[PDB]
Design a protein around this ligand. Structure first.
Ligand SMILES: Nc1nc2c(ncn2[C@@H]2O[C@H](COP(=O)(O)OP(=O)(O)O)[C@@H](O)[C@H]2O)c(=O)[nH]1
Ligand SMILES: [Mg+2]
Length: 166
């Protein structure tokens, strides 16, 4: 049984928590108390090999924050969540994809830019924009929607596949 860390990072509201709890409790949550920071684990099987995945769903909390930075150095999988129907999450992934290079002090993490909130018609972020920003860094782009587990499997799976190959 291997152990991988899903270092999640994105805008506060894209649906990072609702995505984690979904794979765990299995239910759409509209308010999972944004004022809560804890590590959510999950034992599942990727492809004939069970592997404990310590999901790291950071929360809000302002002021001093040294535990979130320490996790950026310990975990390895980076699920850069970005709500396509928000736009601010996109600008949040631009800078969020620099501090990761700070912590590890290098540009070679199994990075993964996911676009949450892709189960609606209001598409403020066209796929061409996320394709020109993610493809530029050389990172895979996927879709996700906690409102129906749509894409949640393509993100978590492709994440363990990037850490294994590395
Ligand atoms: N339609 C839709 N709304 C979502 C989705 N994920 C989050 N939201 C909305 O965004 C808000 C924040 O969700 P939540 O996951 O609790 O916040 P987070 O912890 O910052 O991700 C909620 O009020 C939801 O209505 C999703 O997959 N689909
Ligand atoms: Mg939250």
């Amino acid at each position: 049984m291997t152990e991988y860390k899903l270092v999640v990072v994105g805008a506060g509201g894209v649906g990072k928590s609702a995505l984690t709890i979904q794979l765990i409790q299995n239910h759409f949550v509209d308010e999972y108390d944004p004022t809560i920071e804890d590590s959510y684990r999950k034992q599942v099987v990727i492809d004939g090999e069970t592997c404990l995945l310590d999901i790291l769903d950071t929360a809000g909390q302002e002021e001093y924050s040294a535990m979130r930075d320490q996790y950026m150095r310990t975990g390895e999988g980076f699920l850069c969540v970005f709500a396509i129907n928000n736009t601010k999450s996109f600008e949040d992934i631009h800078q969020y994809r620099e501090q990761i290079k700070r912590v590890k002090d290098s540009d070679d993490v199994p990075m993964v830019l996911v676009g949450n909130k892709c189960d609606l018609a209001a598409r403020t972020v066209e796929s061409r924009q996320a394709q020109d920003l993610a493809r530029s860094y050389g990172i895979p782009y996927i879709e996700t929607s906690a409102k129906t587990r749509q894409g949640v499997e393509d993100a978590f799976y492709t994440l363990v596949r990037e850490i294994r190959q590395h």
